[PDB]
Amino acid sequence: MTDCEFGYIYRLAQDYLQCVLQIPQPGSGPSKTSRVLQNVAFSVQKEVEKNLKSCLDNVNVVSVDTARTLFNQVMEKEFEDGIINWGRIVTIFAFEGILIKKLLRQQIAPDVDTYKEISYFVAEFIMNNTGEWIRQNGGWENGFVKKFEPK
């Protein structure tokens, strides 16, 4: 239902993970909303990775649990001043992209059925901590897309 509920947000986090992993699904392709988010979130992830080269080469992400704990430290720090904006929501997807790259390279017991887990808790955080703001600011089609679509 609607674009601020779990299903829509899970589909966005899923698409972003398939983009980072280089495994887009075959079948009509992603939505306009997803295509704009992928382009802008990836540009941010590239910057975050450069800006944290030492910090990222220190932690090891061997499991879904460890990735959730690391994502929790990030979200707490990112929103420690209490303010929500589109740039910070874009930053959530950039961090899920970095976490799935480290999990693919460091998951002690690999499992291709664990990218869906990361997407799940990312959508869980977005809906429970930013879902009200998103809907009150136009949602994804009249909020996110209008602000970040090509001019």
Ligand X SMILES: */C=C\C(=O)N(Cc1ccc(Cl)cc1)c1ccc(O[C@@H]2CC[C@@H](N)C2)cc1
Q: Which residues bind ligand X (CB under 6 A)?
A: 55-56, 58-59, 70, 73-74, 77-78, 95, 98-99
Burial (Cβ within 10 Å: 0-12, 13-18, ≥19) of residue 117: middle
Query: What is the closest distance, in whole angstroms, from the C-beta atom of residue 123 to ligand X in the complex?
Result: 18
Closest to ligand X by CB, 31 or 114: 114
Query: What is the closest distance, in whole angstroms, from the C-beta atom of residue 22 to ligand X in the complex?
Result: 19
Query: What is the closest distance, in whole angstroms, from the C-beta atom of residue 29 to ligand X in the complex?
Result: 28
Residue 70, Ramachandran bin (φ over 0: left; ψ between -120 and 50: alpha; else beta): alpha
Give the CA distances from residue 96 to residues 6, 9, 27, 87, in Å, rounded to whole numbers and listed in that order.
16, 13, 24, 15
Closest to ligand X by CB, 59 or 112: 59
